[PDB]
Design an enzyme around this catalytic site. Structure first.
Site, PDB file in Angstrom:
ATOM      1  CG  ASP A 190      -4.641  11.479  -6.675  1.00 44.61           C
ATOM      2  OD1 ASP A 190      -4.169  11.562  -8.230  1.00 44.61           O
ATOM      3  OD2 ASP A 190      -3.686  10.534  -6.337  1.00 44.61           O
ATOM      4  N   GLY A 197       1.000  -1.166  -0.092  1.00 46.50           N
ATOM      5  CA  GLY A 197      -0.146  -0.080  -0.023  1.00 46.50           C
ATOM      6  C   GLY A 197       0.702   1.093   0.052  1.00 46.50           C
TER       7      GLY A 197
HETATM    8  C1  LIG Z   1      -5.705   2.663  -1.296  1.00 38.58           C
HETATM    9  C2  LIG Z   1      -5.026   2.838   0.052  1.00 38.58           C
HETATM   10  S1  LIG Z   1      -3.362   1.836   0.112  1.00 38.58           S
HETATM   11  O1  LIG Z   1      -2.784   2.191   1.405  1.00 38.58           O
HETATM   12  O2  LIG Z   1      -2.544   1.874  -1.101  1.00 38.58           O
HETATM   13  N1  LIG Z   1      -4.042   0.386   0.034  1.00 38.58           N
HETATM   14  C3  LIG Z   1      -5.071  -0.271   0.702  1.00 38.58           C
HETATM   15  C4  LIG Z   1      -5.865   0.414   1.636  1.00 38.58           C
HETATM   16  C5  LIG Z   1      -6.916  -0.221   2.293  1.00 38.58           C
HETATM   17  C6  LIG Z   1      -7.334  -1.464   1.907  1.00 38.58           C
HETATM   18  C7  LIG Z   1      -6.746  -2.120   1.037  1.00 38.58           C
HETATM   19  C8  LIG Z   1      -5.452  -1.530   0.250  1.00 38.58           C
HETATM   20  C9  LIG Z   1      -7.059  -3.158   0.732  1.00 38.58           C
HETATM   21  C10 LIG Z   1      -6.695  -4.347  -0.305  1.00 38.58           C
HETATM   22  N2  LIG Z   1      -7.759  -5.168  -0.647  1.00 38.58           N
HETATM   23  C11 LIG Z   1      -7.376  -6.110  -1.459  1.00 38.58           C
HETATM   24  C12 LIG Z   1      -8.560  -7.203  -1.617  1.00 38.58           C
HETATM   25  C13 LIG Z   1      -8.609  -8.236  -2.065  1.00 38.58           C
HETATM   26  C14 LIG Z   1      -7.343  -8.814  -2.566  1.00 38.58           C
HETATM   27  C15 LIG Z   1      -7.329 -10.003  -3.541  1.00 38.58           C
HETATM   28  N3  LIG Z   1      -8.095 -10.207  -4.793  1.00 38.58           N
HETATM   29  C16 LIG Z   1      -7.152  -9.266  -5.911  1.00 38.58           C
HETATM   30  C17 LIG Z   1      -7.864  -9.246  -7.094  1.00 38.58           C
HETATM   31  C18 LIG Z   1      -9.457  -9.102  -7.303  1.00 38.58           C
HETATM   32  C19 LIG Z   1     -10.018  -9.916  -6.067  1.00 38.58           C
HETATM   33  C20 LIG Z   1      -9.424  -9.821  -4.773  1.00 38.58           C
HETATM   34  C21 LIG Z   1      -6.370  -7.953  -2.653  1.00 38.58           C
HETATM   35  C22 LIG Z   1      -6.420  -6.627  -2.046  1.00 38.58           C
HETATM   36  C23 LIG Z   1      -5.672  -4.253  -1.083  1.00 38.58           C
HETATM   37  C24 LIG Z   1      -4.417  -4.304  -0.276  1.00 38.58           C
HETATM   38  C25 LIG Z   1      -2.969  -4.113  -1.022  1.00 38.58           C
HETATM   39  C26 LIG Z   1      -2.991  -3.704  -2.367  1.00 38.58           C
HETATM   40  C27 LIG Z   1      -4.267  -3.507  -2.980  1.00 38.58           C
HETATM   41  C28 LIG Z   1      -5.616  -3.678  -2.331  1.00 38.58           C
HETATM   42  C29 LIG Z   1      -8.178  -3.321   1.497  1.00 38.58           C
HETATM   43  O3  LIG Z   1      -9.248  -4.250   1.484  1.00 38.58           O
HETATM   44  N4  LIG Z   1      -8.252  -2.447   2.378  1.00 38.58           N
END
Ligand SMILES: CCS(=O)(=O)Nc1ccc2c(c1)C(/C(=N/c1ccc(CN3CCCCC3)cc1)c1ccccc1)C(=O)N2
EC number: 2.7.11.1
Lengths: 33, 271
Positions: free
Chosen positions: B131, B17
């Protein structure tokens, strides 16, 4: 598994997050940095 | 008593992230599944993003909307800061767009209604996002849009803004030209977003930053032939050079193309 099935129950049976979490104290922003 | 990492069972990592890894976790007392973003205190300070992460937390922690990723709470220990965030089961919206190339009208309109509703909620509180782009959006259990990053966001109670921020293809003319900007920059970005959803590429795509800047400031919009008249009407009404002339968010939600194509469903609420 029963995680996918656990995720589904969370969507349909929402918890009172505002109370279950929005009530618990949190560190002040100053403390963090 | 506040939370501690011992209050959770880490299931597995979800990916990288912003300035930290995200893990799927379950809070013990409630057996409630959430995402945990872990930041290292030393990395932050040494990267000078201290007074940046605070603002992102300061803004995101006070927003409660079905299409805004919820921050439940946060805590810290000796070396780490942990953000307790809503888990978006379907992941990254940008991955889905990349996989499909482009979204059909139903999917695009549904996302647009959700986006406009969430941005309207922000604007009613003087929060400007600044953004909006596919990469900052996640998708819920039923595919609902979730604004998930607030890195360039600002609570702007009165004075206009001067900071250039956002992403190249999404910059509104006023930022490129060095003018002050206001909440209407989000209306412009919503128009770029609708176009990218339906076409698969942003409207002012160019080989160089100078040619893209040029296309944006001349609003050199060229609609592909396969777009419906309704989608073009909405995009054209958002991508207006003059901020005051851009269609308001309420207008996006009530636009006929949105009403006719959106299949938006509100998540079940507690009670
Ligand atoms: C956008 C804010 S951040 O700090 O850049 N990342 C973030 C923040 C909060 C989160 C998340 C990320 C997720 C998060 N959820 C997520 C949910 C499910 C998956 C697995 N697969 C990925 C392909 C589609 C079906 C589901 C991967 C990630 C995530 C984490 C890390 C990178 C991308 C997505 C989540 O559910 N909550």
């Amino acid at each position: 598994n029963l995680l996918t099935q656990a995720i589904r129950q969370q969507y349909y049976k929402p918890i009172d997050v505002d109370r279950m979490y929005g009530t618990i104290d949190s560190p002040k922003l100053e403390e963090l940095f | 008593r506040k939370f501690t990492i011992d209050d959770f069972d880490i299931v597995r990592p979800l990916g990288k992230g912003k300035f930290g890894n995200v893990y799927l976790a379950r809070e013990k007392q409630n057996k409630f599944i959430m995402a945990l973003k872990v930041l290292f205190k030393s990395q932050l300070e040494k990267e000078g993003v201290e007074h940046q992460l605070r603002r992102e937390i300061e803004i995101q922690s006070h927003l409660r909307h079905p299409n805004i990723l919820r921050m439940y709470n946060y805590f810290h220990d000796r070396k780490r800061i942990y953000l307790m965030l809503e888990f978006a089961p379907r992941g990254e919206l940008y991955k889905e767009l990349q996989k499909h190339g482009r979204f059909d009208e139903q999917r695009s309109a549904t996302f647009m209604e959700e986006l406009a509703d969430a941005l309207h909620y922000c604007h009613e509180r003087k929060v400007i996002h600044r953004d909006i782009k596919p990469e900052n959006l996640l998708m819920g259990y039923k595919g609902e849009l979730k604004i998930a990053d607030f890195g360039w966001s600002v609570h702007a109670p009165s004075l206009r803004r001067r900071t250039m921020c956002g992403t190249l293809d999404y910059l509104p003319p006023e930022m490129i030209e060095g003018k002050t900007h206001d909440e209407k920059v989000d209306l412009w970005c919503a128009g770029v977003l609708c176009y990218e959803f339906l076409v698969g590429m942003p409207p002012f795509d160019s080989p160089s930053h100078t040619e893209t800047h040029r296309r944006i400031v001349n609003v050199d919009l060229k609609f592909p032939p396969f777009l419906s008249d309704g989608s073009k009407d909405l995009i054209s009404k958002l991508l207006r050079y003059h901020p005051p002339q851009r269609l308001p968010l309420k207008g996006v939600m009530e636009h006929p193309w949105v009403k006719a194509n959106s299949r938006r469903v509100l998540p079940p609420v507690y009670q």
